[PDB]
């Protein structure tokens, strides 16, 4: 597969425990040959005071799954550091959970670029984001 490291969803969620990731109710939910997803509930933990998904939190989810995906595409001795991220919020979301799928745009020796698209339970696109990661050698 695209991944260079071995892993399990159980282990990834264990790794993300007791942090902002688990605090937001984010869960690494599934993965394929060249994509990985995380879900996040749409509730008082992730909504703006007026009842809709908080766009800033949608970006937090995007950076989470994209950075995780990036790290899984590196051998031991190397990791990724988030350089920058951007996102367009396309529509309001007020219930259920959203699903963010991270897919690679380009994985180079020094820089990785990831695409993260977030959809509602109705499979409607609510946010599109791009993440730029720096590949560092733990030397």
Where on the chain is the footprint of its own copies (CB under 8 A)?
Answer: 15-21, 23-24, 44-49, 54-57, 59-64, 67, 81-91, 105-106, 108-111, 113, 115, 125, 128, 130, 132, 134
Measured CA to CA, the distance from residue 39 to residue 58 in angstroms comes to 10
| Shortest spacing between CB 29 and its own copies, in angstroms | 17
CB 15 within 8 A of CB 7: no
| Shortest spacing between CB 62 and its own copies, in angstroms | 7
How many CB atoms are located within 10 Å of the residue 27 CB? Answer: 18
| Shortest spacing between CB 6 and its own copies, in angstroms | 18
Measured CA to CA, the distance from residue 82 to residue 112 in angstroms comes to 10
Q: Which of 10, 63, 75, 121 is catalytic?
A: 63
Active-site residue flag, 63: yes
- Helices and strands (DSSP H and E) totals, the chain: 3, 6
Collect all residues with Cβ–Cβ distance below 8 Å to 107 and sequence separation of at least 6: 70, 73, 113
Parallel/antiparallel/unpaired status of strands 111-119 and 36-41: unpaired
Could you list the active site residues? Answer: 63
């Amino acid at each position: 597969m695209l991944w260079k490291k071995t892993f399990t969803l159980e282990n990834l969620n264990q790794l993300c425990s007791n942090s902002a990731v688990s605090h937001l109710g984010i869960e690494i939910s599934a993965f394929g040959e060249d994509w990985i997803e995380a879900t996040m509930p749409v509730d008082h933990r992730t909504m703006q005071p007026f009842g809709v998904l908080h766009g800033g939190v949608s970006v937090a989810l995007a950076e989470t799954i994209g950075s995780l995906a990036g790290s899984l595409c590196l051998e031991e001795g190397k990791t990724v550091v988030g350089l920058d991220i951007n996102a367009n919020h396309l529509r309001p979301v007020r219930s259920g959970k959203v699903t963010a799928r991270a897919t690679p745009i380009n994985l180079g020796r020094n820089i990785q670029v990831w695409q993260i698209d977030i959809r509602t339970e109705e499979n409607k696109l609510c946010c599109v984001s791009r993440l730029t990661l720096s590949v560092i050698n733990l030397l």
